[PDB]
Design a protein around this ligand. Structure first.
Ligand SMILES: [Mg+2]
Ligand SMILES: [Mg+2]
Ligand SMILES: [Mg+2]
Ligand SMILES: [Mg+2]
Ligand SMILES: [Mg+2]
Ligand SMILES: [Mg+2]
Ligand SMILES: [Mg+2]
Ligand SMILES: [Mg+2]
Ligand SMILES: [Mg+2]
Ligand SMILES: [Mg+2]
Ligand SMILES: [Mg+2]
Ligand SMILES: [Mg+2]
Ligand SMILES: [Mg+2]
Ligand SMILES: [Mg+2]
Ligand SMILES: [Mg+2]
Ligand SMILES: [Mg+2]
Ligand SMILES: [Mg+2]
Ligand SMILES: [Mg+2]
Ligand SMILES: [Mg+2]
Ligand SMILES: [Mg+2]
Ligand SMILES: [Mg+2]
Ligand SMILES: [Mg+2]
Ligand SMILES: [Mg+2]
Ligand SMILES: [Mg+2]
Ligand SMILES: [Mg+2]
Ligand SMILES: [Mg+2]
Ligand SMILES: [Mg+2]
Ligand SMILES: [Mg+2]
Ligand SMILES: [Mg+2]
Ligand SMILES: [Mg+2]
Ligand SMILES: [Mg+2]
Ligand SMILES: [Mg+2]
Ligand SMILES: [Mg+2]
Ligand SMILES: [Mg+2]
Ligand SMILES: [Mg+2]
Ligand SMILES: [Mg+2]
Ligand SMILES: [Mg+2]
Ligand SMILES: [Mg+2]
Ligand SMILES: [Mg+2]
Ligand SMILES: [Mg+2]
Ligand SMILES: [Mg+2]
Ligand SMILES: [Mg+2]
Ligand SMILES: [Mg+2]
Ligand SMILES: [Mg+2]
Ligand SMILES: [Mg+2]
Ligand SMILES: [Mg+2]
Ligand SMILES: [Mg+2]
Ligand SMILES: [Mg+2]
Ligand SMILES: [Mg+2]
Ligand SMILES: [Mg+2]
Ligand SMILES: [Mg+2]
Ligand SMILES: [Mg+2]
Ligand SMILES: [Mg+2]
Ligand SMILES: [Mg+2]
Ligand SMILES: [Mg+2]
Ligand SMILES: [Mg+2]
Ligand SMILES: [Mg+2]
Ligand SMILES: [Mg+2]
Ligand SMILES: [Mg+2]
Ligand SMILES: [Mg+2]
Ligand SMILES: [Mg+2]
Ligand SMILES: [Mg+2]
Ligand SMILES: [Mg+2]
Ligand SMILES: [Mg+2]
Ligand SMILES: [Mg+2]
Ligand SMILES: [Mg+2]
Ligand SMILES: [Mg+2]
Ligand SMILES: [Mg+2]
Ligand SMILES: [Mg+2]
Ligand SMILES: [Mg+2]
Ligand SMILES: [Mg+2]
Ligand SMILES: [Mg+2]
Ligand SMILES: [Mg+2]
Ligand SMILES: [Mg+2]
Ligand SMILES: [Mg+2]
Ligand SMILES: [Mg+2]
Ligand SMILES: [Mg+2]
Ligand SMILES: [Mg+2]
Ligand SMILES: [Mg+2]
Ligand SMILES: [Mg+2]
Ligand SMILES: [Mg+2]
Ligand SMILES: [Mg+2]
Ligand SMILES: [Mg+2]
Ligand SMILES: [Mg+2]
Ligand SMILES: [Mg+2]
Ligand SMILES: [Mg+2]
Ligand SMILES: [Mg+2]
Ligand SMILES: [Mg+2]
Ligand SMILES: [Mg+2]
Ligand SMILES: [Mg+2]
Ligand SMILES: [Mg+2]
Ligand SMILES: [Mg+2]
Ligand SMILES: [Mg+2]
Ligand SMILES: [Mg+2]
Ligand SMILES: [Mg+2]
Ligand SMILES: [Mg+2]
Ligand SMILES: [Mg+2]
Ligand SMILES: [Mg+2]
Ligand SMILES: [Mg+2]
Ligand SMILES: [Mg+2]
Ligand SMILES: [Mg+2]
Ligand SMILES: [Mg+2]
Ligand SMILES: [Mg+2]
Ligand SMILES: [Mg+2]
Ligand SMILES: [Mg+2]
Ligand SMILES: [Mg+2]
Ligand SMILES: [Mg+2]
Ligand SMILES: [Mg+2]
Ligand SMILES: [Mg+2]
Ligand SMILES: [Mg+2]
Ligand SMILES: [Mg+2]
Ligand SMILES: [Mg+2]
Ligand SMILES: [Mg+2]
Ligand SMILES: [Mg+2]
Ligand SMILES: [Mg+2]
Ligand SMILES: [Mg+2]
Ligand SMILES: [Mg+2]
Ligand SMILES: [Mg+2]
Ligand SMILES: [Mg+2]
Ligand SMILES: [Mg+2]
Ligand SMILES: [Mg+2]
Ligand SMILES: [Mg+2]
Ligand SMILES: [Mg+2]
Ligand SMILES: [Mg+2]
Ligand SMILES: [Mg+2]
Ligand SMILES: [Mg+2]
Ligand SMILES: [Mg+2]
Ligand SMILES: [Mg+2]
Ligand SMILES: [Mg+2]
Ligand SMILES: [Mg+2]
Ligand SMILES: [Mg+2]
Ligand SMILES: [Mg+2]
Ligand SMILES: [Mg+2]
Lengths: 272, 49
RNA sequence: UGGGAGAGGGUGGUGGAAUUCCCGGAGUAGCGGUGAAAUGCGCAGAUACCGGGAGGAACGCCGAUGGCGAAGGCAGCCACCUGGUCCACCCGUGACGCUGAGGCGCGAAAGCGUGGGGAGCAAACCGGAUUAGAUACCCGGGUAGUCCACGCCCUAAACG
RNA sequence: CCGAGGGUAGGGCCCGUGACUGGGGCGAAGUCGUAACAAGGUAGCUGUACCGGAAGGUGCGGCUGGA
RNA sequence: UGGUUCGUGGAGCCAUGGGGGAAUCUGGGCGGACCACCGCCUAAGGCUAAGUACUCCGGGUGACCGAUAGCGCACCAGUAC
RNA sequence: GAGCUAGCCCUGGCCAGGGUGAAGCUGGGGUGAGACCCAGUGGAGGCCCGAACCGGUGGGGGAUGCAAACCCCUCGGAUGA
RNA sequence: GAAUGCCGGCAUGAGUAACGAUAAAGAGGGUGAGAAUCCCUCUCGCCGUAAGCCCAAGGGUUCCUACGCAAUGGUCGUCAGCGUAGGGUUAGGCGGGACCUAAGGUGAAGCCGAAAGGCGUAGCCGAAGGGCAGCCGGUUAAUAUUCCGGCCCUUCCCGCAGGUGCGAUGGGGGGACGCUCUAGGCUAGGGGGACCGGAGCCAUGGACGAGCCCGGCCAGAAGCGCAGGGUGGGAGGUAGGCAAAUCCGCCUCCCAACAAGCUCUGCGUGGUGGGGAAGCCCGUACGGGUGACAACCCCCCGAAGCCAGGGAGCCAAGAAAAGCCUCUAAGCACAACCUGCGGGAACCCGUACCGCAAACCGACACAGGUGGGCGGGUGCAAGAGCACUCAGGCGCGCGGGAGAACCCUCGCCAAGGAACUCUGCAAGUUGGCCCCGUAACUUCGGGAGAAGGGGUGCUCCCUGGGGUGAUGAGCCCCGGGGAGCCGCAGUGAACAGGCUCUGGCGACUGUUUACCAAAAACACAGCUCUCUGCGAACUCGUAAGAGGAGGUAUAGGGAGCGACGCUUGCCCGGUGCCGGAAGGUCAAGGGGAGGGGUGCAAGCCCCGAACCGAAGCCCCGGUGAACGGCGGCCGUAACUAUAACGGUCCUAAGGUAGCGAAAUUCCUUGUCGGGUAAGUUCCGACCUGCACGAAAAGCGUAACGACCGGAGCGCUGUCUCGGCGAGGGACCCGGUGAAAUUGAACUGGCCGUGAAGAUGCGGCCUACCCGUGGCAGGACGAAAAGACCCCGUGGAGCUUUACUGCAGCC
RNA sequence: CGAUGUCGGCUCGUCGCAUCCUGGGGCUGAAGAAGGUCCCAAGGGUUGGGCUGUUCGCCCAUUAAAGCGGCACGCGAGCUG
């Protein structure tokens, strides 16, 4: 839906906030299962190695369930859907009859009170997790494992999915959010449905501060700098570059393919 | 204005203390040099309890 | 009350033909195209043929000089949801009617905003011919658009 | 107190005028090309969109005021 | 590749990171590419005094200084600052 | 050497008093149901005026200074990047 | 004898500048060898969201007392933060430690690195954060939540007495958390009182009065009372909480849904304990006594603080661990733990003093810098603002005169008002609150405090709402109406916008060259391109490892543009990038035709042509929100003029829209028009664009600005054109007393001359010796071994299709 | 070049005369008035504004006239910037 504001201030006239109506009466989270201390820090042991990180709201990590094959066969009741500061998506709090409480990343269409479960069994319904094999060709799916028993790694961003395209002996072909065509092992779990919160892309930050709230420090142009700092630094009053556009570290930034060629992963990929 | 000396006992101790110098080869040599020199004070005297 | 025809509308789903691209096989010296050509594609293996895969859009025959809607307009198939309408019986109400300034809704195509999609077609645009010259007609490419959702736009030989 | 009117400050409507600019009308015999009327030598007209010295061209759907 | 006077030189010898990879006296290395001959050594395990270097420390001496010299310091100096 | 300065991390603190009045609620109006319109309530914002605080705009002074960046007048931000 | 030499000494400037905020001093009396400067008393002034109190950091004897004045004190000094000595800092409850964890540090397991060493889940360390039991008074010259007095608590250990399956570093609960806005009830704090308590006081015309002045409190166990916070109680089932649980979780039935009940705080009350003014009298360097059997009561305002884990909203979604509760495991159930009561035990370190400053950071008794809490009263709409002033603390450690120039700061001005000037720079005008009233334009919010007005004091009369009290008196907050009074003037003092019109640039709030630039520069939301399928790309690192990210294409990196509106044309020949299992070229290696050296020979040792050999390059395509580029010359229309039209050369293609004398226009003050009496600027046009142009974006845009330009109104000492006055300096006297500079000097003008700008040389002219206040023409004055220029086979930072390498990638 | 601060403005002047005005004079194609031109003469005088950093210049309104030049394109230990 997206919340919109009137221009009672500049920067309030474009600003735009998510709709939280799917956030069920459960705004503060769940101890026990999560949260952990989350360790803010824009850099490695010592030095900054990703520029322009820092500031922005304190967070608690929700330790979510990315391998659903523990509770094969054990169903769970979806108890709530809550805000997760550390991902684009929303998260489902679910209660297993087992007693155990996990969070699943919350797919589009998930309703509270719903039944959900994981395993070879598993009715093909939104929320359920299955090894890729038993899932019908053509169904859209998410939180897909890359290699079996290694955890969900594909399609967890808000409003993303992959679609099952066909099969090939032990592998089923996937079409990933990027549009790539991937052979992913049959035995990999993946949960049916799309991610949801799909209006995430429609949000307009609206002002500088908002950027900072999310811990995004000001990014400065190479043009703004000096020859010591950047290939684009200097010279006089503005300058068009004077070389093929580059990163600060000298590599070209328009076109230069960067995936290493001899990756053994290659023989499992069929697209862009 | 604000000058450059902003005394802090803890800082002076953690920074220039006998135990800091002892911790690394760089520092151990400092004690060696100061000893051979005949320095009355190997490290700065940080006070208080 | 009881029936009947229909592409009337909305949503969800689904079927085959064909075009294009990808992959594999087989296969050669040309294919495309026009008034004639040229651009263009092709021994880096094209065209033509077989097999597999992908994707989008439009629904052949039935089909009519036919049906339906107030108009715009509506056509593969299926289910739901839904509007109008004609017949029969003459059963109920009992003049409850007709029209309609404004208002309000609807409203082809093109166009616009956001997001998606993109096979074929195709403004602009690039070439090749034609011409005195061609910013055209014809040919080879080709982007918006054409498709979908939501929101605008309110035009027409919106014509009987 | 009110009050003709004078003064100050800000608006509404109208008329005149203005370098320059837009198309329009009119002006017997100037230039460019040939769009329309015959099938006008690309049937025509059209709403819209883009493009072009110019008529105009083309995309899209529509009309018979064409076959 | 390093070492040697040896800077690729006709470049041996001595070490070695990489790849190939033997033999036990009629076995093996060397004598400056290489080969023949004549010779000299016996690798891939280790230890070994003395003769040599230095002067924190003690002593002796001086065509060494004599408080701006001589050690930074003749003096409670690596101190005051 | 980050006891100055720059950035980030952990953990605390600080921001007088006033304005303006967003959404959303509630009542009424309107419709077939709506949109929407009036109030009233509400208390939003890198919103406004202005101390503390953080600055450093213009001018004057100072120039072996009170000061190796100062003073006076003026001015910017002041619930936020 | 020179090195802007080095070290030391002493001069010159010179009794010169200065003596560190313009908050301010005067007198009397002491003391003393010696007083503007020390003590006392009186009068005067300054601070009072401090210039007063309390912490923290830092400092480290500066504290208190006695005796001192050589030096330190910008003077003096009998004084002191100084010299000598002596004394002073008292804790189970305050802070830190025998508690806990954060970032980070360290680090057994383990991983890595020539060595040194670098990583590293557990653990450990690590704190103004979590946890944890003392409040009020009194005494010292100097300590006190530490000593003493009262009242009240906390653990441990041993006893008894009574309970219970007790029992872990293990399980679970809790602890446990944001921002803004807030309700109820309290307390701190404050105001008033005809009431209570007090020494006193009637002054100078009046006042013996419900008169003036001062004060009417603090702490406090149990129990109560009043607020409020936490919390459901059963019984089954159980496969999860990494062993086990009766606990917790998840189902399922019952009764609660209430805070009823349990607890837990806060606040009142509370046995008892303590404080208790002015004034008057005393001797202090200060406190003591009396007032006193002091009284200790009633109303009102009232928190940002308490109840606290309160409520509501919102998006950016808001520490951990232990104490504590609970559950069970080993074990042990003569153990142990729980409750009550007794007795005993309770360590280590800090505690003085300064603490917005003379004791800390600034070489100084330095006008600078320094985190937290209390910060009274009155008035001005409010407030931590502003003026005055409680408590309290000060008069800033040179003074005395004088009343010049000149400077600083400040006050006023006839007439004129920007004529000033690069510029209204500066200064003025305006100024708070209430009430009318507000334009273009606009993104519908704004523009708006637009502009422009009126009101503002005091007295009396009537009157409407609340709040606390009971539905009333009072006390306190907001209002309305009517008469009237005074002055030049009523936010009568202090604090408090000048306004408009129109351009440029940037959307906006923000950021920046600490110490000459705050901007049109950076950033910014937003747009696009490109990479990256996850052990991702990229970044740091030799590595290990780490960030990215405990993220996964709606995500992450790189680049450019930079809200928003309308848009972003053509050129792929060159460079880049992307795509091309063909071809040419291409290294080690494979391959050995053939040839060489030695041997009597088997042999050993060399070169060595075919041919097979990657990436790269060549070559073929693609790609501009990739690097970039986007023409010349002739002719032509029935007045001239111009050229829709045509011809021709060249290019990879020959700038489209939109804009244009511009932040871009050389010629240029282009030319018209507008503003002016007059306009190289400004605004609007034209287009001949030296040398705009579409994401180093093009053209626009409301709002916004200590940005830059032009105009007008208002107002003025900016100016015509000055004048007067004030204080701080300057001047004189007493005290203390620098500086850069300095070849030595007995240091005049003119005209010449001289290395070409003479006090010093020639000639002439003038001129008794020595000072003081002033002015700045000269001493090519001082100051910095010119920073421009050039030189040196000097040096650095930067770039690239300069050379040569290296990391890195292939 | 072990430093001679560089345009313009302001303040303060002072000097040259090849004189802008004012005084004297000759020639005039000098009727008068008013000019032209040359000689003598520097004693005094030589205005306020618009534009521009400007010097200079171009304008507005006046004037007896709106003079030229030197003094380190006079004058920054006098100011501005
Ligand atoms: Mg936790
Ligand atoms: Mg480290
Ligand atoms: Mg940027
Ligand atoms: Mg720069
Ligand atoms: Mg560079
Ligand atoms: Mg440039
Ligand atoms: Mg550049
Ligand atoms: Mg009937
Ligand atoms: Mg329509
Ligand atoms: Mg359409
Ligand atoms: Mg978008
Ligand atoms: Mg086509
Ligand atoms: Mg075509
Ligand atoms: Mg019709
Ligand atoms: Mg007009
Ligand atoms: Mg006209
Ligand atoms: Mg025709
Ligand atoms: Mg035709
Ligand atoms: Mg035609
Ligand atoms: Mg066309
Ligand atoms: Mg058309
Ligand atoms: Mg060598
Ligand atoms: Mg050998
Ligand atoms: Mg030998
Ligand atoms: Mg030999
Ligand atoms: Mg030998
Ligand atoms: Mg010596
Ligand atoms: Mg001697
Ligand atoms: Mg010495
Ligand atoms: Mg409202
Ligand atoms: Mg507010
Ligand atoms: Mg604000
Ligand atoms: Mg403000
Ligand atoms: Mg000499
Ligand atoms: Mg000396
Ligand atoms: Mg003197
Ligand atoms: Mg003097
Ligand atoms: Mg003096
Ligand atoms: Mg003083
Ligand atoms: Mg005063
Ligand atoms: Mg005062
Ligand atoms: Mg001492
Ligand atoms: Mg003392
Ligand atoms: Mg004494
Ligand atoms: Mg003295
Ligand atoms: Mg002093
Ligand atoms: Mg004495
Ligand atoms: Mg003393
Ligand atoms: Mg102990
Ligand atoms: Mg500890
Ligand atoms: Mg610990
Ligand atoms: Mg840790
Ligand atoms: Mg650790
Ligand atoms: Mg370590
Ligand atoms: Mg603590
Ligand atoms: Mg304690
Ligand atoms: Mg004391
Ligand atoms: Mg138990
Ligand atoms: Mg426990
Ligand atoms: Mg626990
Ligand atoms: Mg009397
Ligand atoms: Mg009490
Ligand atoms: Mg268990
Ligand atoms: Mg007393
Ligand atoms: Mg709460
Ligand atoms: Mg622990
Ligand atoms: Mg103490
Ligand atoms: Mg103390
Ligand atoms: Mg303070
Ligand atoms: Mg002082
Ligand atoms: Mg000070
Ligand atoms: Mg401060
Ligand atoms: Mg207060
Ligand atoms: Mg006020
Ligand atoms: Mg004040
Ligand atoms: Mg005047
Ligand atoms: Mg006057
Ligand atoms: Mg005036
Ligand atoms: Mg002027
Ligand atoms: Mg002037
Ligand atoms: Mg101006
Ligand atoms: Mg001003
Ligand atoms: Mg502007
Ligand atoms: Mg800006
Ligand atoms: Mg700054
Ligand atoms: Mg600066
Ligand atoms: Mg500045
Ligand atoms: Mg600024
Ligand atoms: Mg690192
Ligand atoms: Mg990692
Ligand atoms: Mg991570
Ligand atoms: Mg990106
Ligand atoms: Mg830019
Ligand atoms: Mg920019
Ligand atoms: Mg721009
Ligand atoms: Mg372009
Ligand atoms: Mg090109
Ligand atoms: Mg290319
Ligand atoms: Mg090409
Ligand atoms: Mg390539
Ligand atoms: Mg190759
Ligand atoms: Mg122009
Ligand atoms: Mg230009
Ligand atoms: Mg004009
Ligand atoms: Mg003009
Ligand atoms: Mg440009
Ligand atoms: Mg560009
Ligand atoms: Mg700003
Ligand atoms: Mg302006
Ligand atoms: Mg004056
Ligand atoms: Mg005076
Ligand atoms: Mg004197
Ligand atoms: Mg003399
Ligand atoms: Mg001379
Ligand atoms: Mg002489
Ligand atoms: Mg002479
Ligand atoms: Mg002089
Ligand atoms: Mg001079
Ligand atoms: Mg020199
Ligand atoms: Mg230069
Ligand atoms: Mg050279
Ligand atoms: Mg020079
Ligand atoms: Mg000199
Ligand atoms: Mg000099
Ligand atoms: Mg003469
Ligand atoms: Mg004459
Ligand atoms: Mg000049
Ligand atoms: Mg002159
Ligand atoms: Mg000259
Ligand atoms: Mg000059
Ligand atoms: Mg001078
Ligand atoms: Mg000076
Ligand atoms: Mg300048």
């Amino acid at each position: 839906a997206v919340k919109k504001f009137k221009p009672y201030t500049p920067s309030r006239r474009f600003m735009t906030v998510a709709d939280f109506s799917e956030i069920t009466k459960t705004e503060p989270e769940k101890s026990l299962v999560k949260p952990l201390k989350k360790t803010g820090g824009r850099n490695n042991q010592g030095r900054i190695t990703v520029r322009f990180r820092g500031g922005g709201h304190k967070r608690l990590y929700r330790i979510i369930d990315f391998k659903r094959w523990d509770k094969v066969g054990i169903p769970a009741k979806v108890a709530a859907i809550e805000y997760d500061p550390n991902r684009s998506a929303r998260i489902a709090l679910l209660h297993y009859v087992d007693g155990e409480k996990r969070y699943i990343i919350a797919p589009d269409g998930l309703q509270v009170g719903q039944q959900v479960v994981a395993g070879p069994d598993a009715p093909i319904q939104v929320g359920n997790a299955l090894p890729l094999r038993f899932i019908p060709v053509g169904t859209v799916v998410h939180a897909v494992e890359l290699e079996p028993k290694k955890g969900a790694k594909l399609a967890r961003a808000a409003g993303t999915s992959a679609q099952i395209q066909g099969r090939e002996g032990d592998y089923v072909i996937l079409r990933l959010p990027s549009g790539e065509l991937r052979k992913v092992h049959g035995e990999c779990y993946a949960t049916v449905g799309a991610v949801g919160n799909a209006d995430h892309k429609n949000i307009v930050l609206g002002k500088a501060g908002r950027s900072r709230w999310l811990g995004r420090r000001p990014h400065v142009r190479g043009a703004a700098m000096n020859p010591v700092d950047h290939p684009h630094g200097g010279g006089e009053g503005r300058a068009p570059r004077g070389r093929p556009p580059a990163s600060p570290w000298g590599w070209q930034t328009k076109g230069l393919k960067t995936r290493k060629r001899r990756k053994p992963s290659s023989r499992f990929i069929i697209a862009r | 204005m604000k000058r450059t000396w902003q005394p802090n006992r803890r800082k002076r101790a953690k920074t220039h203390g006998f135990r800091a110098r002892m911790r690394t080869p760089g520092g151990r040599k400092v004690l060696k040099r100061r000893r051979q020199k005949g320095r009355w004070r190997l490290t700065p005297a940080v006070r208080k309890r």
